[PDB]
Amino acid sequence: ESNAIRMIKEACEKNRRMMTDEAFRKEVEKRLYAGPSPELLAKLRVLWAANKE
Amino acid sequence: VKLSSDINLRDFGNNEYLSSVQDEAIRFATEQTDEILSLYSQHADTEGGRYVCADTFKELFPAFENKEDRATVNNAIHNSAAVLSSTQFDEVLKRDEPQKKEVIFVTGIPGSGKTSTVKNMMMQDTTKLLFEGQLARPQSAFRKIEQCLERNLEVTIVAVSMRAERASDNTYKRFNEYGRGASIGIMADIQANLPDGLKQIRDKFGDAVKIVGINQDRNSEFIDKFDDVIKMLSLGSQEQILGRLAEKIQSDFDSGKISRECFNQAKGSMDLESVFAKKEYSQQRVVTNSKGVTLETKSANELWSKVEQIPVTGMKAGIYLLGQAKKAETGQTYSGEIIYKDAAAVFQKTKNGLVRHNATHNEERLAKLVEIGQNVSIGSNKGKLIVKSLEYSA
Ligand SMILES: CC(=O)N[C@H]1[C@@H](OP(=O)(O)OP(=O)(O)OC[C@H]2O[C@@H](n3ccc(=O)[nH]c3=O)[C@H](O)[C@@H]2O)O[C@H](CO)[C@@H](O)[C@@H]1O[C@H](C)C(=O)O
């Protein structure tokens, strides 16, 4: 089997850990859909502000 | 660095705000491509730009900053984000990296945990690129897979799957917390047409593309064989899934399980009345008595089984075949006892037989204005509802 298929299978285990381990699920789901970080957002404001019309 | 393709405009019509947000988005993506891609790679949570996704690109647009605006502006910026992701895909492929031989596509309905599954993947030395996106309409993915094969890269497609209802619950939470949900129209479209797109890919590329699945209803079960992936994903037609989702978001709003804003984003641009009208009640009847009403369905063996019982006082005995109900014509007034209602329809026994009303009428909710057992007149004057009670004692 390829590395990719193994990587997917190992990801499926950690998906199963998310169901039991609640401390693990909150560590995963915190970042995902939050939005840009303060460092990235600072850079972005300079990018957006420098190109208004 | 130029964009890989032109950005398709949508017609927003009279909404000038979205029409301007779209133009601001296209201008930004087109003119500031170099610096957008640099920030995507060097500074976002994207494995240095190897995790490629249109949703993550939305975060680099100014209109997408506040959580309040995200559901509104989403469809105005998406195509710019998608073409940016397509451009980024190509730039990662241009990097001469002989060690890195694997490209992974992750696909599935919104809310199925595609992105959370990608977070749980540990990057490897051979992993070149990881693309999250829809493959239900696979025309665009053909070009991506084509240029992977041109460079002797090993393509793997992971189809993450989940029931529409459980997936819809996950989008509600994500919307409430981060302002980012998913419409029912696109959830039904992806889930219904994904088997076709994967077979379309399988027939065009064959063994050159490995196609696997993740069933999130069976504790994230890995599915190796393509025939098993198609059986997992075959969860109904677009009409069925959209219909079930339409009734679900409406029931959840009527019960107070979701807000009006979480309802409107889920609804998206759907006319729910139009969806509800398509629902069929053939092989179905309501039995009434002094204790209440009982919905029953008939299977092929000619046997009625109880689906739902609702206790109601003050009703006579009766059997009403819901499939034989006359659709209520607009303009006229229908007077009679409500014998049954659900998220889609309201059934009224008039003097000219059983009549069916849509539970919504021009964005106005009929079902909440009447109760089962209640005697009422329902009529629409100038596309505006008039429901009067006819209850009396004499
Ligand atoms: C179906 C759809 O429009 N959007 C959905 C799809 O995005 P995606 O797959 O990234 O987007 P694409 O429009 O299907 O496009 C896929 C590819 O098509 C080319 N293209 C895209 C647009 C365009 O104008 N011109 C053009 O050439 C380009 O190569 C791109 O990579 O898949 C995502 C799954 O993670 C969903 O979240 C997303 O829906 C969420 C809720 C939403 O819609 O906001």
Residue numbers in the entry:
A (entry chain A): 8 to 60
B (entry chain B): 2 to 395
What does the original paper state about this entry?
A prototype of a Gram-negative epsilon/zeta TA module, the epsilon_1/zeta_1 (ngε_1/ngζ_1) TA system, is encoded by Neisseria gonorrhoeae, an obligate human pathogen causing the sexually transmitted disease gonorrhoea. The toxic activity is inhibited by co-expression of ngε_1 antitoxin, corroborating that the ngε_1 / ngζ_1 locus encodes for a toxin/antitoxin pair.
Indeed we observed a strong electron density for a UNAM molecule positioned in the active site of all four ngζ_1 polypeptide chains. To our surprise, Asp56, which most likely deprotonates the substrate before nucleophilic attack on the γ-phosphate group, is in hydrogen bonding distance to the C4′-OH group of the hexose moiety of UNAM, substantiating phosphorylation of this particular group. We observed a number of interactions between ngζ_1 and UNAM and nearly all residues that form hydrogen bonds with UNAM are strictly conserved among homologues, but not in authentic UNAG-3′ kinases. Most importantly, Asn75 and Lys59 form hydrogen bonds with the 1-carboxyethyl group of UNAM which could explain the preference of UNAM over UNAG by ngζ_1. As expected from our initial, qualitative in vitro characterization, these measurements confirmed the apparent KM for UNAM to be more than 10-fold smaller than for UNAG or UDP-glucose.
